[PDB]
Symmetry: D2
Subunit: 103 residues, 4 copies
């Protein structure tokens, strides 16, 4: 029986959480961790980034091996249809509710 | 310092809080309390409701004085230019940060 | 058959909208208009604001009846249980979907 | 001179956009594409997923190569400090503003 703050602390430590009051059933959220990536790994090896961004990186940072760019950790959801939503966001209700549970 | 969860519990108790790492300076968030409002007061009293809502409420809930609709608590922000942003939303960075302070 | 951008334009013009793909049924969103409010009203007469805020306003702006503070427009939801959630949030799915429809 | 809806259409088409009225400077948002990934890859190959999720996938989608899971597209922000914020959020101000601009 938890607040959003305890759910967040639980997420930071790599757990799965959910709210009883959600409309969809069988969902949970989780954290994806932070990582620092070499810039030329971004420009040349990463499939999941748009070309526009890769071009901007090349333009403003370049191909130095030393240079690395940090990707922040963030929340994701296993939604009701079984898809993974990157970037889960907390509604006002999620934030002030106290019906969070560990899954 | 403080996590977002402690900031949330602190907001539930009516305090103003803010993050050091925010781009704009001099800001803070606070909570607007929850309230239950009569359908009469909704259809006929409130300036801040669109007609479409007032009409939806009329065609549904009706004239009963007893009928009430709960308007929920929610977060608001005193922004850098001094405007009050209703319905402040927490970014991923905000949620995972531990640089919250009581204001 | 609308995008989120078209749905937002409908909202700005005072309509109710919804996504077919939402889990909860019978929900919709609407926009609550912006307003400029007198500093005195906020500090002395507004029931829905917390005291910490009323105290901050008083220190920051004295009440002259000409000093006004702007409260922004924002989106709200009639939720599945019939309560009104102020401050509705658009999920990544909400934002990228094209299953928006107008509700009456 | 753009609404959030136009900025979103531009994002879905691979452009970088930003708001004039943001406090931080030099920031922009972009979309990360959706992809469908086989279960076996998720459990055994992807490192940027927590172990509890990989286990859930193993327990639920099984050991099959047949099963695939869809990872949705989503918005990301290049922040004022040059870090890439995954899962960028549209504030009430963002969604109702008409000061969006294409940056690349
Ligand atoms: N745009 C905007 N205007 C604001 C805001 N806060 C206050 N106002 C204005 O201040 C008036 C009086 O506010 P009140 O004393 O809280 O008196 C309010 C309040 O007690 C109640 N009410 C309406 N919606 C809500 C809500 O979401 N939450 C709560 N707690 N009360 C609400 O209805 C009463 C009458 O509402 P109105 O006729 O609209 O009259 C409102 C509206 O003209 C705001 O954040 N944005
Ligand atoms: N569309 C999509 N595909 C996904 C997603 N999660 C995993 N994948 C796929 O799984 C591949 C391997 O992921 P990885 O082992 O984490 O290997 C990744 C990961 O180590 C890293 N990476 C890139 N962006 C990020 C990020 O934002 N955060 C983290 N933590 N790592 C990232 O770069 C490596 C190579 O990236 P890719 O070439 O994209 O290669 C990714 C992409 O093929 C997702 O949410 N969406
Ligand atoms: N596919 C998806 N992508 C991103 N987020 C998703 C999602 N499915 C569920 N969520 C989120 O998970 C919590 C409740 O889940 P639900 O109660 O099942 O939500 P739903 O009834 O569909 O309403 C939807 C409304 O809820 C809000 O986001 C919810 C909310 O934080 C958001 O404001 C949306 O407009
Ligand atoms: N007028 C306003 N109305 C609503 N919310 C506002 C706001 N001013 C600031 N915020 C929010 O407050 C926190 C940090 O504040 P900032 O660091 O000043 O953010 P900013 O650089 O303006 O970028 C803006 C980006 O940050 C995120 O919203 C921020 C973020 O939650 C969101 O993703 C947006 O795209």
């Amino acid at each position: 029986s938890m607040t959003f703050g305890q759910a967040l602390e639980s997420l930071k430590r790599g757990h799965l959480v959910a709210r009883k009051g959600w409309n969809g059933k069988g969902m949970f959220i989780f954290m994806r961790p932070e990582d620092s990536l070499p810039t030329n790994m971004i420009v040349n090896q990463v499939k999941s980034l748009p070309e526009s961004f890769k071009r901007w990186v090349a333009n403003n940072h370049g191909d130095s091996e030393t240079d690395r760019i940090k990707f922040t950790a963030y929340l994701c959801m296993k939604a009701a249809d079984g898809t993974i939503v990157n970037g889960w966001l907390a509604s006002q209700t999620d934030m002030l509710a106290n019906d969070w549970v560990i899954v």
